[PDB]
């Protein structure tokens, strides 16, 4: 299972005249590459970004992409002309193309396309296809594209051979960053619940990598099932933030603790108690005039 590699492209067209394309690349949840409309060349976001390609290999790929981007922009503009009444600006296009790692050596590749935020087409095998629920209009365009066997051949090369190759490289190359562990820091807080006379307690965990974490409120050894985990949120420094809130009758707070498990902890879970010496002091430093 493990790692999945995505190259994401977003293309926006406003009118005949105006357009831009930007792309970002991810391995796992770490961003390895950046391309932006105004930049001629792709930019590494990690030291290990070139993976195991030679300057030569890299630049060749870069070349293919550079050419593709400009061609694609025009190619779309034509499609609209062909489309006529059926489609009109503004148009938004997203492509997700990635190779997904399987235990060495094995992988699955994908190329997916979204139009106006909906997933419509994918490249499968040798050719493009509309997915289920796609608008019937696209079929001509798929046909017109599928004719270009040269493009098709090249895309099979990228998907079939190149991605898994490049990525297996990335994995050796960037191993250190990939496998890093950063410890979380937790702090408590409270807010008054919608329920009258009730309090909402919040356990904050911030700064961890890798992503998987466990958070629960407990009273003694018994988990409180009233806990709702929030979504994971990005920290800017490649770390994760998350919080768990439980609601309780005012005064029920004493005896509770927020408990966190993480890979970086190893054995030592963080048990943080409401009304702890630290909670009290830490709380003091947060005060404010709502």
């Amino acid at each position: 299972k493990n790692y999945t590699f995505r190259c994401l492209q977003m293309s926006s067209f406003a009118n005949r005249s105006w357009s831009r394309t930007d792309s970002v690349v991810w391995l796992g949840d770490l961003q390895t590459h950046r391309w932006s409309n105004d930049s001629a060349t792709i930019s590494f976001t990690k030291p290990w970004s070139q993976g195991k390609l030679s300057n030569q290999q890299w630049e060749k790929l870069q070349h293919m992409f550079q050419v593709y981007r400009v061609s694609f922009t025009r190619d779309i503009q034509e499609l609209v002309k062909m489309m006529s009444p059926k489609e009109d600006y503004p148009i938004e296009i997203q492509l997700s193309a990635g190779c997904e790692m399987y235990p060495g050596n094995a992988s699955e590749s994908f190329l997916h396309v979204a139009f106006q935020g909906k997933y419509v087409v994918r490249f499968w095998g040798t050719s493009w296809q509309t997915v289920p629920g796609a608008p019937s209009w696209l079929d001509l365009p798929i046909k017109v594209l599928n004719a270009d066997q040269g493009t098709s051949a090249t895309v099979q090369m990228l998907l079939n051979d190149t991605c898994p190759l490049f990525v297996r490289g990335l994995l050796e190359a960037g191993k250190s960053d990939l496998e890093k562990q950063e410890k979380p820091v937790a702090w408590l807080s409270s807010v008054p619940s919608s329920a009258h006379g009730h309090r909402q307690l919040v356990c904050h965990v911030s700064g961890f990598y890798p992503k998987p974490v466990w958070v629960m409120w407990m009273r003694g050894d018994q988990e409180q099932q009233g806990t709702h985990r929030g979504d994971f949120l990005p920290n800017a420094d490649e770390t994760w933030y998350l919080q768990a809130t439980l609601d309780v009758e005012a005064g029920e707070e004493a005896g509770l603790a927020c408990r966190v498990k993480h890979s970086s902890l190893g054995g030592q879970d963080i048990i943080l108690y409401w009304g702890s010496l630290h909670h009290i002091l830490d709380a003091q430093k947060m005060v404010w005039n709502h």
Partner: T-cell receptor
Amino acid sequence: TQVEQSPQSLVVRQGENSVLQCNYSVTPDNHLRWFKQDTGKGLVSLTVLVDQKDKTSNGRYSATLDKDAKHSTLHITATLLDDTATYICVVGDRGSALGRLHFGAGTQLIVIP
Amino acid sequence: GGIITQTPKFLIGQEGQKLTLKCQQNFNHDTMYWYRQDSGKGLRLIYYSYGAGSTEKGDLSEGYDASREKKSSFSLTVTSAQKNEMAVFLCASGSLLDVREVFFGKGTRLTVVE
């Protein structure tokens, strides 16, 4: 300007073999193809080349392409009098019907008896 | 299995006149073009179409207009003729599914006389 052919004009003696040239700058370059236009007339397709290194022949007509060199040549073998009419090198930038064709000025061939 | 035929073969005009020419294509081709030949320069697109009625301007569009009335017919109109002008105009038609199938008309030759 993006497609170049020389010589501007070529003279050959009947039965001889003549060679014509196209060099080009367009990108992408899906294909290159050659046309013959008789004066007072339209274009007739001679040969079409798709591959990175390719060769094709249509009858007494032969062409080669080197995509790496962005260069092509057309061969006429045992040239006849009918072969005088201008010869045009065209490059297509897409492999789908969305593409555009880039046209050279042409080379005029005069065949002498 | 077709011809693509431009009419007229030969055209006479007066400065400031408006001249309209037609292209007839039977190959079932969706795409159609109008090109100009200027001696020693090579063909330049004026107008193109994906069907009827549609028209996308060629890099030589201004000064001309074109109408696609139907699948099989494409017309080009020269809004005002230019004195002493001589020109050649060419109709080509294309396949959506094969970029390489393109066919050309025999051309229309225009002489403007004051």
